[model samples]
Target: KLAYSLDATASFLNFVSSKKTHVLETHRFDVLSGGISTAGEAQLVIDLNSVNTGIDVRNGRMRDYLFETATYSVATVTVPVDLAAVAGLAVGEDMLVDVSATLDLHGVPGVIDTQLNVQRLSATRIMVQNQSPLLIKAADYSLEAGIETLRNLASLNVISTTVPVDFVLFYEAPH
Candidate 1:
């Protein structure tokens, strides 16, 4: 088992309203430890129910109508690391690498290609952070209906269909 679980600091950004400029933020996600593998596999799981948009009514509506959290419950991202590159890094070294990842959300799966900034914090700890925002479309994940419900419920003129996600994940090596 890995020695450490992910620190809580991952978030995703969304836009609401007709102007398409209002921002909605959610920062609740879980980085499970047992899922990590020495062969360079990691998974980040997000409980849709935990999402907070900084408003009570909006949050509740999102959970019930937008995400249908009770049914879907979770979204997962699986990332594959290069063990050779990680093993070669000296303590305190940071490397930027492009990685391929898979995201499963709303019962739909998609591939993600993004760059990550990896840093060794200590002999036992490493930090993997995104260099840029990852753009995801609601339609791509079959989330259009939920989004439409959110729009009508919110009485918004327009809501951006694309979301940008960011993360700062911390992991520890196995003991």
Candidate 2:
């Protein structure tokens, strides 16, 4: 009776990127969805097409070059957790746990070991934030060529293939 749903309105996922090893930047996805089931299934789905780099042109290029949204539209990440443990949190209580999450991108599956700081904010609400960023290698997802395409498009020398992902996720349930 208490399956949780992700509160996309209040949650944000960000990935850190760098070019030439000095120009660090942050970007986010405009849309995110997924949640934990009462049976303990947990997932986070990201719309790669919703990538926002603050500039319109950059966004389009990222979609076309890096993500290749025409071929792949979404990436899914899943982490295992004890649903009963999450349901046991009392208001104001929190717990930090390490989890290995699987990310499926561009038909490739990668595992990321991450730390999650989970807190209970209210009777019906819970917040989960990354204690440490999840590191992902573009090569793992067959996106190295995509990154290379962006470098060629922008005439840049270097673009880091590894990115750190972080997120603050809120989940709520209705009785």
Candidate 3:
């Protein structure tokens, strides 16, 4: 397994609220390693339940329906980082990198080619940020819901197709 995980500090996931006048922020991240890329088995666990959308009920419902947290619990993505891809990386420099991998969410594996900015803080430490937005539908993860729902009886339209995901990390060089 590879030796590195992201350190989520002040991370926010926002979605539109009523004509886009308001936005929700969800803050959380789990860092699981202390070393930089050195192996082929790197894994990341994203806690979907930790999101805060300004409303407790809304957040709970999101965890239960949108993410199906009961069944999936966590969204994981495992991949191998080609050290050669970062061979020329230097301390205090930010480099754009593309990671092609599979994201396991709601028991489904989808190929994800995400573009990220890797900033080296030191020889063994760095921070990675997402340069683009990741848009996904609730149905894609087996959740039954839409952004706009109307049946007269208190229409509950609670689904955002554009989900923002971003992360940062600190790594120490292998000794």
Candidate 4:
């Protein structure tokens, strides 16, 4: 028997931002945590306040105006896992799995039915990734108002309400 858990520090989640129709930038959360349980539950938590776009003022603006970190702290994603299938996968074999996931952001929850790519790296290591960017809308989480506010305050000509997120996660079970 083995227990597999996510290596939070090794996992990375990336998101893109676009404004003025052509200006695009990539950002990521500074803090993340989550893992799969032996009972077949998996989850990931992203700290909205940790949004980093490489600039201090912009980062603060995103936290206070866009995400309102004080009011909404963390966004969570959860999905169920088949421990048996995952553990039985042979190394060097690539598997594409269809699964349903739920994202909880700003007190709002949305369904995500997508395919995930899985690869067994070693006897105790595994990799998981999204096949495509998980696109989300601002209105879904009631963040449109914040995006408008951010555009106005930042003196931006335009800001897109669509958000695309991608992630590569690593897990290990060593006992």
Candidate 5:
């Protein structure tokens, strides 16, 4: 049985804005191992309150206005992947593939399609990383209103309606 768990040391979240602002955050995830014929599922939970834009005041405003962290404390991504496809990968082998998932943000759910670079570090270890940023549109998740509110509250000239998120995830076989 090949079951893997998340390695927090190699996992993190990053968001970049049109204004060249970067917000780094942390998240937690779970993996369910169900063996073959059942590809299993993964869920990533992001703590909106951990958003750090390198500025304390901005982070506060983001939590209160942009993310409304008081009301919606977390965002989630649910992934259902076919592990059988890569079950035969030997150590040092790498592959690039597309993954389909759903992102629930601010109480709204939307489909997400992204590419992942997978590498087999060992028989029981693997590394998965995003090939590029996952573009999220605020309007799709009813977050445009919050963006507008933050813009007004911060008196900013422009705030992007689209956000790009990237991350690197590591997994290891359960002992």
Candidate 6:
């Protein structure tokens, strides 16, 4: 079985800027290998509690309100990868792969397409960076941003009705 972990210090997300910024620090990630026939199929699990945006109160609210940790402790993404993408990746060479995965957030599942840039730093070590914009609504996840709340006082829902959720993930292949 292949094991991997996230480097939280090297990853972040741009949720809000001027008023409030939600920076998610990678807490932990795990991938499990199934069998020989389904070797490439893997399941990725992310810890939502590690959502740290340099603010304690905001993080708490995201964990309790947005994520609803009581019901869903973790957010998961399941996908089948193309092993060839990283099979011959050389040092300093970044390989891009298209991944079709299901993002499970707030107990809801959304099928999304994303690309992961794999940069081989050494013989057995590689850094994977994922930069994609995911659109989500507070109401869809059972989150409320009433005007009464100081943090979300200036919150406004535009006609687009889609909030951009972008993230960068760095993963290291453990020896």
Candidate 6 structure quality by residue, lDDT tens digits, 9-65? 564544432233433233222222221112555455566776655667766766776
Tell me how candidate 4 scores on lDDT.
0.87
Per-candidate alpha-carbon RMSD to the true structure = 3.2, 1.4, 4.2, 1.6, 4.5, 5.8
Candidate 5 residue 19 C-alpha distance from true site, Å: 3.0
**Model 3: runs farther than 4 Å from truth?**
8-37, 144-159, 172-175
Q: Candidate 4 on 25-126: residue-level lDDT in tens? A: 989998888777788888888988889899999999889888888988899988898888888889987788898899998878998889999899998888
For residues 11-108, write the lDDT of model 1, one tens digit per residue. Answer: 23233323246655444433232245665677777777777666779778877877788888877888886777876778999999887888888888
Give the Cα lDDT of each candidate. 0.70, 0.88, 0.56, 0.87, 0.71, 0.55
Candidate 5 TM-score, C-alpha based: 0.81
Model 5's lDDT to the true fold? 0.71
lDDT of 2 by residue, 1-175 (tens): 3388899989999998899857999999989998887777778899999999898998999898888889889999888879878879989999998888888898888887778999999988989999875788899999999899888888999999999888999988874
lDDT of 6 at 56: 75
Off by over 4 Å in 2: none
Give the Å error, residue 108, model 5. 0.4
Show the lowest summed lDDT stretch of 10 residues, model 2. 1-10
lDDT of each residue in 1-175, candidate 5, tens digit only: 3356667656776776654253323322222112212346666667788776767787787788877888888887777766765577888998888878778788888888888887888877777778876778899998899888877877777778877777777777765
TM-score winner between candidates 2 and 6: 2
Once model 6 is optimally superposed onto the true structure by TM-score, how far is the C-alpha of residue 20 displaced, in angstroms? Answer: 9.8
Error of 5 at 66 (Å): 1.9
Per-candidate TM-scores read 0.82, 0.94, 0.70, 0.94, 0.81, 0.65
